[PDB]
Design a protein around this ligand. Structure first.
Ligand SMILES: CCn1cc(NC(=O)C2CCCC2)cn1
Ligand SMILES: [Zn+2]
Ligand SMILES: [Zn+2]
Ligand SMILES: [Zn+2]
Length: 465
């Protein structure tokens, strides 16, 4: 049980308005044949065009919502809509394109998918709310066959060119005209009552129905993300490394230790309330403080209400000491907090569009995160950049930068004994620059840092006496 059997039943009720008379009894094997595709009894890595919900969740980075609306069907123009916001009009002869024949429409489809997916996935998963026209339009831009590799690299082939008779991945498909061996899933097969808009609108108010195919494509992908990542969560599923995952995660650990150690040194809190990951470890193990942990899994639907996390009778006095919320999304942070909150609006290859303003952050695991809301931080301020270190001023080993290329560091934010004494040493200059790179990496990945209003790095200078 790995792939979806072609002999699995496909429910056809959603298809009968576009395809009247369609048999109630239908398999994927018969549906694919009706779509104009021939599988030829082939055991070459592509057993079915359709995939299971479990296979779709493993390939969420490949998801592209797709919808087709009749403009007027061999005689009528079709409006092809994608969750990228693109609408194309194919004549049989929010970006809205005018009617053009299939031979040019298919070139645009290949360019659009390749640019969207080349840094995300090795494939495309068309996410549908199948009513008929989208399935019967596939033969005009899709070719299938055995699994193949790119003509310029080792990656699996996703495109085909009729001009050259060659195959390419998303990175090398310029000038290609056919989508090759795409995958697809029909959300209607999951058991829903009522139409797409009524189901989507139960969980999301950010995607309206501007009555175009791309709006339906967007809503379909949104509903699928809600079902697979919001109401249902699976953190066991691992996702491949596609970018700066490791550097970002290492930076996150460095920044957390730096900020918490400095808050404890500057304000000397007798107790720290660490709220979040039930598997968390003390980020500052040498700190004198009474460290208390509170279990809260990452919220994927709405941000936690602070009244439910803190109230209903723990140290009980969360007002004593400091509260640490490291990626623990709450509606309104208490004034005595240290906070790391992912900004869902960030544009990156790790952050995928999500449900109801939320985003799907995929870094080793998939985490649907509720919409970023500035009002959650009303009791705090933005945490400014600083580097603090009490370690001895001593270089050690071969230096990365040569003596002639090295410039001594000058910075008001290098909080060290050497900078207090008027001249930053080589070791602290190296560590400052490495820390600044890690910090910038974390910020640019979408993380935002917030702190209690009394936080002042001026209080760190007296820890050198
Ligand atoms: C032009 C100024 N300047 C930057 C550095 N950079 C470095 O030493 C980094 C930090 C340790 C690894 C390499 C030296 N000098
Ligand atoms: Zn390639
Ligand atoms: Zn939505
Ligand atoms: Zn130093």
């Amino acid at each position: 049980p790995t792939h979806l059997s072609v002999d699995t039943k496909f429910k056809t009720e959603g298809l009968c308005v576009d395809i009247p008379g369609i048999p109630k009894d239908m398999t994927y094997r018969r549906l694919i044949s009706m779509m104009g595709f021939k599988m030829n009894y082939q055991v070459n890595g592509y057993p079915n065009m359709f995939i299971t919900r479990e296979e779709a969740i493993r390939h969420v980075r490949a998801w592209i919502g797709f919808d087709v609306e009749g403009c007027h069907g061999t005689n009528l123009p079709l409006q092809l809509g994608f969750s990228t916001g693109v609408n194309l009009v194919a004549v049989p002869t929010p970006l809205m394109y005018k009617g053009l024949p299939w031979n040019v429409v298919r070139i645009k489809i290949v360019q659009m998918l390749s640019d969207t997916l080349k840094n995300l996935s090795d494939r495309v998963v068309f996410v549908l709310w199948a009513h008929g026209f989208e399935l019967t339009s596939m033969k005009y831009f899709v070719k299938i066959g055995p699994e193949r590799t790119c003509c310029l690299c080792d990656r699996r082939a996703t495109c085909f060119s009729t001009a050259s008779d060659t195959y390419a991945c998303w990175h090398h498909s310029i000038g290609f005209d056919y989508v090759y061996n795409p995958f697809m899933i029909d959300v209607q097969q999951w058991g829903f009552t009522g139409n797409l808009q009524s189901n989507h609108d139960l969980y999301c108010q950010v995607h309206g129905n501007a009555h175009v195919a791309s709006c339906d494509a967007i809503m379909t992908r949104c509903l699928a993300v809600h079902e697979c990542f919001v109401k249902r969560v699976d953190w066991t599923i691992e996702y491949p490394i596609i970018g700066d995952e490791l550097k970002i995660n290492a930076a996150c650990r460095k920044v957390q230790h730096m900020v918490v150690k400095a808050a404890l040194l500057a304000d000397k809190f007798p107790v720290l309330h660490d709220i979040g990951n039930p598997k968390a470890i003390k980020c500052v193990p040498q700190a004198d403080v009474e460290w208390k942990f509170y279990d809260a899994q990452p919220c994927s639907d709405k941000a936690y209400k602070i009244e439910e996390l803190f109230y209903s009778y723990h140290s009980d006095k969360f007002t004593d000491g400091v509260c640490l919320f490291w990626n623990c999304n709450v509606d309104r942070y208490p004034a005595n907090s240290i906070v790391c909150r992912f900004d869902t609006r960030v544009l990156s290859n790790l952050n995928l569009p999500g449900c109801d303003g939320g985003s799907l952050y995929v870094n080793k695991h998939a985490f649907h995160t509720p919409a970023f809301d500035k009002s959650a931080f009303v009791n705090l301020k933005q945490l400014p950049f600083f580097y603090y270190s009490d370690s001895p001023c001593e270089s050690h080993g071969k230096q990365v930068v040569s003596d002639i290329d090295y410039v001594p560091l000058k910075s008001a934010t290098c909080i060290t004994r050497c900078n207090l004494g008027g001249a930053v040493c080589r070791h602290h200059a190296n560590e400052y620059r490495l820390y600044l790179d890690a910090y910038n990496m974390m910020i640019s990945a979408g993380f935002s840092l917030w702190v209690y209003k009394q936080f002042d790095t001026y209080n760190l200078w007296n820890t050198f006496t």
